[PDB]
Design a protein around this ligand. Structure first.
Ligand SMILES: CCCCCCCC/C=C\CCCCCCCC(=O)OC[C@H](COP(=O)(O)OCC[N+](C)(C)C)OC(=O)CCCCCCC/C=C\CCCCCCCC
Ligand SMILES: CCCCCCCC/C=C\CCCCCCCC(=O)OC[C@H](COP(=O)(O)OCC[N+](C)(C)C)OC(=O)CCCCCCC/C=C\CCCCCCCC
Ligand SMILES: CCCCCCCC/C=C\CCCCCCCC(=O)OC[C@H](COP(=O)(O)OCC[N+](C)(C)C)OC(=O)CCCCCCC/C=C\CCCCCCCC
Ligand SMILES: CCCCCCCC/C=C\CCCCCCCC(=O)OC[C@H](COP(=O)(O)OCC[N+](C)(C)C)OC(=O)CCCCCCC/C=C\CCCCCCCC
Ligand SMILES: CCCCCCCC/C=C\CCCCCCCC(=O)OC[C@H](COP(=O)(O)OCC[N+](C)(C)C)OC(=O)CCCCCCC/C=C\CCCCCCCC
Ligand SMILES: CCCCCCCC/C=C\CCCCCCCC(=O)OC[C@H](COP(=O)(O)OCC[N+](C)(C)C)OC(=O)CCCCCCC/C=C\CCCCCCCC
Ligand SMILES: CC(C)CCC[C@@H](C)[C@H]1CC[C@H]2[C@@H]3CC=C4C[C@@H](OC(=O)CCC(=O)O)CC[C@]4(C)[C@H]3CC[C@]12C
Ligand SMILES: CC(C)CCC[C@@H](C)[C@H]1CC[C@H]2[C@@H]3CC=C4C[C@@H](OC(=O)CCC(=O)O)CC[C@]4(C)[C@H]3CC[C@]12C
Ligand SMILES: CC(C)CCC[C@@H](C)[C@H]1CC[C@H]2[C@@H]3CC=C4C[C@@H](OC(=O)CCC(=O)O)CC[C@]4(C)[C@H]3CC[C@]12C
Ligand SMILES: CC(C)CCC[C@@H](C)[C@H]1CC[C@H]2[C@@H]3CC=C4C[C@@H](OC(=O)CCC(=O)O)CC[C@]4(C)[C@H]3CC[C@]12C
Ligand SMILES: CC(C)CCC[C@@H](C)[C@H]1CC[C@H]2[C@@H]3CC=C4C[C@@H](O)CC[C@]4(C)[C@H]3CC[C@]12C
Ligand SMILES: CC(C)CCC[C@@H](C)[C@H]1CC[C@H]2[C@@H]3CC=C4C[C@@H](O)CC[C@]4(C)[C@H]3CC[C@]12C
Ligand SMILES: [Ca+2]
Ligand SMILES: [Ca+2]
Ligand SMILES: [Ca+2]
Ligand SMILES: [Ca+2]
Ligand SMILES: [Ca+2]
Lengths: 619, 148, 644
């Protein structure tokens, strides 16, 4: 936050140093008459600096003064070199400024003066950050390619630029064109920059070299959500086999898309990234048909076998909690005889009958099932991450947590059974509502139940969470109000408010209208009570519970095409998970191989379609 | 006349129809006489005879639909429309009659949220409705795109 | 599924055989120089095959090489014949490929070489399936008519095509034009193909011959939902009687529409088909006025007499269940004396008083009424079908099942009364809630109650069924959680959860908030209970029951013009049913006959209307001959943003 305060003080200081210098002010406006009067002096300070560590030639290039800049090059040719020496604009030469301002005469004048075309603008104002408004690169070829000047790009190559210039991020020129906000004109430059490669043998052509994250220009368009650049890069990876009237048969190349992928492949990059614009690449021409052929053939049957094994697992755990051992109460009821009702307790040496030997089989099914969960899920949490990015995979989210918390509460019950601890009701009653509500994970493979389970999640972290802050405000105010009213009275004719923990639990239920409401009709209630409960029922039942339905009803039609895009991405995340963990004896690799068809060793997927007729008479 | 797209033939087919008020495919001098009197004009009997005989290639004496289609391609005004608009219209039009309706702009608006009353659907129709049948053409549909 | 895997292996193998053959590769690109070097050899394999069983002429026609194809015909004229011999593209000749690619010079060159214009492309890649992207037919005339080439159709007729070519489905040329996705240009070809008939005496003109389902081209447009082809075929079947200013009086022909129909007539084809695009033909020009004249005149009074007979039937059955015989308890209460409350039981020799002789009349009304249901409904289930297509007639659906299950449960009660079985409460208490909720069938003849009964059905098989899978997940988790909490405690001060069948029935009701909630306020409840019930009431009452109202409210305005189209189709299904089962003494035949008016023996329906007078339209086409607002314009920019 204080960096932007410090950056604003730098720009105001630069305007101070220009006005307080007769060279820099004269180079600022144009003052071609004034430069000849100063530069003919003896010590006219040609290597003068400023706040950004700029010279007089940096100023004349920044304010676009061709006439003043040539005078500075004639009187001092050393200023074509010597970039800015500040921390912010480090390394930026005068050639960089003339290219970004898209000047044609000043660039050609600098190239005659032997300018450096391979300098690096490696300051903190050119790096890819949310603080900077631009990410142009580091090299003059990277600057000319992003401001869309095909004249200067052709000019820089003829004077010996490098087509493989990599940044501090490792990005080449072709990576930077993808990160630009103008998608259409980036496609026009992308064809131009490959056209001047044409001799890039190198054992790496041009658009196959990755940056420091291992991403090619094809996969970087997949992560950043460039739908326009993604369709432009599909032209290289398809082959039209035959055209039979209104019927073509293309042949896409699954060598950088399919998740056979010992490297990091494109379906893992899209499904783990946080951008909501990358999930639109799951509807394009090779990827939509690839996922459906995985999900219909091998994705849905293997997901419904894991849905039936888990369902018979959580029935076997349920009947170990129903038939769990109990004995009658040992000592006495003599806990104070008006508020005790428990009459059984837990047994120690439970396994001494044949009916409990069946349950011991059922409990060993449970505990072994609780270890297998902590061996296929925990070595992905402590290994691939230190829990920095585990939370929202896509939006799928809690079912990682609910299956860990289930496997923890089973193993707490194992500890309390071996040491014969007292309360096993608490670790079980978590483990069941965590156990059965995790069956909702398996409702993502059914179109009837799929988009409804997403809307349950988008209300709990949203329109139900913001209501439960303004519910706990109300039922702290009224429950502390109802408590002091019945504090001075008889707690057996109306005992909804005798303890303060009980008065919080009555008013939580009177807000929800699930219990009735305090009324006796035999004894005179306090006169203050009927006032403060009629005040309560209006702003609980008439106002705020009818304002959830107005708010959940308003949300449900607004996010009603987002939850359908979220469901088609939950299938891709499920398919990639089932493909990774299952062995290769099951799940054959997608697409047709090309060894016995004379196409190489890569894997292809053909798609035929009927396009149009109305656009066939005229096309 | 084999230069004419799908939506123009559907416009010209009912355009043939309101001339031909006997339910066949023949424009005699009678039915073009019934039209030109309803325009308030006094049709000259020579003028009625010429306009039929000018475009009648087969020589039967009655203008059918391929001759009315041949004449209308001669006297076509122009259209220079876009690819994105034409592909939009063919998806918007569902039954393929060449017309978007009031029943078919309810489907397009329900597709993207946008709660319209059935009155406000017809309030959209009459703005794009240049000529008037309670339907928007393809020519009227292009008009409501390139206005800006 | 594995067929598409096998079909993809065929196409990659075809590209292998082309590259591995010097003839087929040279015929592929164009290589007119390379063919003269190979074909001048001795054994240059002119009848060479491939994966699709194709020759070099099939390749040159497929990749559109006119120059290479003529060289193959000069060096070997036998290749104009000999179609593909694979299973997939069986029978496809080289003339077929030149027609589909819409080549004009290659077709005319093949016809000079005596090509077969009556060959059949009877492979598995041309049949009408959802696997194939096209259904063009089998004959070259069928191929040229579907790719919209009027030049090649005129060329094929002059060289002796057959205008009555029928497929393996029985479809003629005119049937195939209806099944094409471009409706407007199919109308233009339909006039052309009939124009070249003009001598089709045959005792069958051209567009009256049916396919192997008995459907004419007029009725096939009715089934497949071609609204454009349906209005085009109405031009033949109307007659303008008189035009009186802005007032015409047309005369439609009800010889293939009206369901007098000893054959299968058009109102039965539309109302039984599964397509949702065929129900738009119920709004066209003869059919909308035909249904209304049946429903207003004879459809609604006969449907409200069956609604009053059935209502007095289900009152007579109700009072036989109220006045059913019971005697006091015989032996003892001695079933374990803390959980028994029943104190009457069923009687055996019930009919021994005059008050039960009235009921015996009322029960014989019921049982005879239960047989008549199983004689007018079951001989349509076992006869017209083996229950393959009984389920969704239109969407009407369950009322077939609810009237069979009612007539079954009455006859179960007849068996248990004769053999004097114990529990008659179970077959009755089904038979009443099945009996009275079948009165909702008769709410389709009232516009107030009509479209509301459809929305009850579209929630039960939809937004209520997907909620009851995620309700049974929750009330298995919490009911098994609440059970083990109160398992170790006292089941009379709070006994909502003492059995596991009872704990499932408490938590089903606490989810619905119909019973109150476990609270005693005299004894200390478990500390775990108040945590796990506050967790429960948030995701039952605050979240998931307020998410039905947000979901049923979102659906109800989306399907709000579909349920109005579903109601106008429930009237047509009712009208055709009432017309079929009632005798001909009632229900006179619709329309005016034509015997005593000099029109034949067929039946007509006249419709007069006032059309317009739109000046701006008619003036623009006439010169061609010669020798409220503010938020509407906001909506169009919302469409311009959506289109962009
Ligand atoms: C051993 C178990 C099976 C093992 C292997 C499966 C091999 C083939 C897998 C193909 C998937 C099925 C499919 O592809 O179709 C799924 C649903 C059809 O639902 P159903 O007929 O199975 O439900 C009624 C049937 N009943 C009540 C008995 C559940 O299609 C839909 O999208 C409708 C959504 C249905 C909602 C409930 C989902 C299933 C619930 C199961 C709980 C038990
Ligand atoms: C992948 C592996 C999955 C796990 C494998 C499960 C089996 C493991 C083997 C043994 C453990 C069994 C269950 C553990 C708890 C013990 C329960 C119990 O104690 O015995 C079960 C009770 C009988 O009780 P008993 O032993 O006291 O008397 C009988 C006395 N003796 C045995 C001498 C005759 O039997 C009953 O109640 C049955 C209640 C009926 C309700 C079952 C719910 C329906 C089942 C499946 C639906 C899923 C649909 C598919 C999608
Ligand atoms: C999304 C959810 C929002 C998060 C907030 C949830 C609110 C509830 C969470 C926890 C419960 C709060 C404490 C309850 C336990 C109190 C037990 C206790 O004994 O404590 C002592 C007193 C009452 O004693 P007694 O009646 O049991 O003994 C008899 C008293 N004799 C002898 C005078 C008759 O209780 C007291 O004063 C308690 C102190 C009063 C104020 C507590 C408020 C909690 C603090 C911040 C909430 C922020 C919400 C707004 C955002
Ligand atoms: C009991 C035994 C006697 C009851 C009725 C005697 C015979 C009634 C039928 C005689 C035929 C004449 C008729 O047309 O009578 C049906 C009327 C029609 O209604 P409308 O006057 O509004 O037609 C005009 C609608 N406009 C104004 C919107 C254009 O309706 C009625 O009288 C209703 C007649 C009873 C129908 C009950 C069927 C069960 C329905 C359950 C719904 C859940
Ligand atoms: C074509 C299909 C229909 C065919 C004919 C219909 C059925 C008639 C034929 C035979 C009769 C059997 C039906 C009843 C079976 C049990 C008979 C029975 O047990 O007795 C009938 C009771 C007389 O009472 P009770 O003999 O037991 O002695 C007095 C009892 N004590 C002392 C407590 C007052 O009759 C009552 O109660 C009448 C009170 C019921 C309320 C009105 C009934 C209808 C309501 C509305 C009709 C119009 C609405 C719009 C349509
Ligand atoms: C239209 C869309 C919705 C349709 C789908 C809804 C499906 C769910 C509906 C019903 C589920 C059937 C559950 C029936 C269980 C009753 C079994 C029974 O009759 O005996 C009850 C026994 C014990 O009871 P007790 O008090 O007599 O012994 C007390 C123990 N002692 C002897 C030591 C004192 O408990 C037991 O067996 C516990 C057995 C646990 C198994 C419950 C789960 C079974 C079904 C799972 C499928 C659901 C998947 C989708 C959700
Ligand atoms: C002794 C026998 C009965 C062992 C039975 C064990 C199974 C019932 C367990 C063991 C491993 C479990 C699986 C381990 C990993 C996962 C992935 C997990 O994925 C998520 O949570 C993704 C959602 C998110 O993104 O948060 C969902 C449950 C699932 C399929 C589990 C389903 C239930 C399984 C098959
Ligand atoms: C939106 C509101 C303003 C319109 C409807 C609300 C009224 C129906 C409520 C609001 C205040 C209520 C009153 C608040 C206080 C009392 C005292 C109350 O006295 C007792 O507590 C009974 C024993 C006793 O102390 O004598 C009797 C009901 C009464 C008159 C209530 C009757 C119902 C009233 C008028
Ligand atoms: C013994 C005396 C009192 C005579 C009683 C006769 C009526 C009460 C019953 C006998 C036969 C019944 C009919 C049998 C068959 C049908 C068709 C049935 O059709 C459907 O269910 C169509 C909707 C769907 O597709 O589900 C609707 C009820 C109805 C008219 C029934 C209405 C009530 C009827 C006329
Ligand atoms: C997302 C939630 C937190 C919405 C905010 C509402 C809270 C104000 C509610 C919800 C959960 C409630 C708690 C759930 C569990 C308990 C334990 C409960 O147990 C006891 O201490 C007494 C013993 C018994 O009740 O049997 C007392 C009420 C209390 C603190 C409740 C007080 C009111 C709470 C904090
Ligand atoms: C289990 C026993 C006791 C009673 C069960 C009642 C069930 C099976 C019955 C009673 C009420 C019935 C529904 C009542 C209303 C409609 C709407 C209608 O347009 C189609 C039938 C439909 C959808 C019925 C389907 C079957 C139904 C749900
Ligand atoms: C306090 C104890 C007894 C009960 C606690 C239950 C809580 C932790 C459990 C039970 C029901 C669960 C929810 C059930 C449904 C969904 C929707 C799904 O798309 C994501 C997970 C999510 C959002 C679960 C989150 C965790 C959850 C709220
Ligand atoms: Ca309520
Ligand atoms: Ca005429
Ligand atoms: Ca003519
Ligand atoms: Ca339309
Ligand atoms: Ca119009």
């Amino acid at each position: 936050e204080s960096w932007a305060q410090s950056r604003d003080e730098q720009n105001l200081l630069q305007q101070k140093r220009i006005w307080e210098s007769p060279l820099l002010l004269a180079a600022k406006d144009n003052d071609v008459q004034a430069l000849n009067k100063l530069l003919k002096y003896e010590d006219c300070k040609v290597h003068q600096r400023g706040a950004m560590g700029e010279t007089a030639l940096h100023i004349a290039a920044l304010y676009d003064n061709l006439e003043a800049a040539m005078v500075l090059m004639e009187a001092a040719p050393e200023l074509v070199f010597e970039p800015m020496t500040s921390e912010l604009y480090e390394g930026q030469t005068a050639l960089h400024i003339a290219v970004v301002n898209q000047n044609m005469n000043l660039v050609r004048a600098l190239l005659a003066r032997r300018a450096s075309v391979s300098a690096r603008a490696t300051g903190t104002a050119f790096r890819r950050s949310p603080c900077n408004l631009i990410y142009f690169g580091e090299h003059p070829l990277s600057f000319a390619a992003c401001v869309n000047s095909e004249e200067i790009v052709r000019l820089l190559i003829e004077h010996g630029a490098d087509i493989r210039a990599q940044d501090s991020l490792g990005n080449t020129v072709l990576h930077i064109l993808i990160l630009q906000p103008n998608k259409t004109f980036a496609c026009q430059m992308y064809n131009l920059l490959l056209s001047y490669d044409r001799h890039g043998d190198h054992l790496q052509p041009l658009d196959l070299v990755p940056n420091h994250q291992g991403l090619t220009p094809f996969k970087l368009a997949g992560v950043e959500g460039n739908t326009v650049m993604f369709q432009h890069l599909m032209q290289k990876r398809k082959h039209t086999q035959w055209t039979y009237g209104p019927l073509t048969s293309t042949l896409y190349d699954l060598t950088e898309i399919d998740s056979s992928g010992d490297e990091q492949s494109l379906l893992e990059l899209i499904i783990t990234t946080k951008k909501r614009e990358a999930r639109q690449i799951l509807d394009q021409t090779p990827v939509k048909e690839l996922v459906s052929l995985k999900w219909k053939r091998y994705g849905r049957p293997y997901f419904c076998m894991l849905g039936a094994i888990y369902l018979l697992y959580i029935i076997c755990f349920t009947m170990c909690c129903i038939y769990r051992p109990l004995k009658p109460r040992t000592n006495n009821r003599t806990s104070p005889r008006d508020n005790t009702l428990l009459q059984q307790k837990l047994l120690q040496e439970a396994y001494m009958t044949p009916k409990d030997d069946i349950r011991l089989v059922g409990e060993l099914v449970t505990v072994i099932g609780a270890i297998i969960i902590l061996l296929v899920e925990v070595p992905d949490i402590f290994r691939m991450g230190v829990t920095r990015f585990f939370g929202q995979t896509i939006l799928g989210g809690p079912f990682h947590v609910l299956i860990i918390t289930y496997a923890f509460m089973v193993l707490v019950t194992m500890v309390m059974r071996l040491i014969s601890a007292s309360g096993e009701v608490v670790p079980m009653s978590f483990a069941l509502v965590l156990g059965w509500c995790n069956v909702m994970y398996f409702a993502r493979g059914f179109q009837m139940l799929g988009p409804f389970t997403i809307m349950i999640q988008k209300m709990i972290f949203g329109d139900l969470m913001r209501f439960c802050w303004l519910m706990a405000v109300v039922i702290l105010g009224f429950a502390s109000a109802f408590y002091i009213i019945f504090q001075t009275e008889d707690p057996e004719e109306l005992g909804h408010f005798y303890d303060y923990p009980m008065a919080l639990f009555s008013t939580f239920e009177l807000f929800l209208t699930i219990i009735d409401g305090p009324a006796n009709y035999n004894v005179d209630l306090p006169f203050m009570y009927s006032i403060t409960y009629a005040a309560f029922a209006i702003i609980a039942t008439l106002l705020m519970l009818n304002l959830l339905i107005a708010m959940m009803g308003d949300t449900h039609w607004r996010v009603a095409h987002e939850r359908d895009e979220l469901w088609r991405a939950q299938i891709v995340a499920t398919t990639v998970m089932l493909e990774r963990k299952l062995p290769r004896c099951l799940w054959p690799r997608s697409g047709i191989c090309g060894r016995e068809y004379g196409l190489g060793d890569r894997w292809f997927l053909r798609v035929e379609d009927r396009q149009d007729l109305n656009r066939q008479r005229i096309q | 006349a084999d230069q004419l797209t799908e939506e123009q033939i559907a416009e010209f087919k009912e355009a043939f129809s309101l001339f031909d008020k006997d339910g066949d495919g023949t424009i005699t001098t009678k039915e073009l006489g019934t039209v030109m009197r309803s325009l308030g004009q006094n049709p000259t009997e020579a003028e009625l005879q010429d306009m039929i005989n000018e475009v009648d290639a087969d020589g039967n004496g009655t203008i059918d639909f391929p001759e009315f289609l041949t004449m209308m391609a001669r006297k076509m005004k122009d259209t220079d429309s876009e690819e994105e608009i034409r592909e939009a219209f063919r998806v918007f039009d569902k039954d393929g009659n060449g017309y978007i309706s009031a029943a078919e702009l309810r489907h397009v608006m329900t597709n993207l949220g946008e709660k319209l009353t059935d009155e406000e659907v017809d309030e959209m129709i009459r703005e794009a409705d240049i000529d008037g049948d309670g339907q928007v053409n393809y020519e009227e549909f292009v008009q409501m795109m390139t206005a800006k």
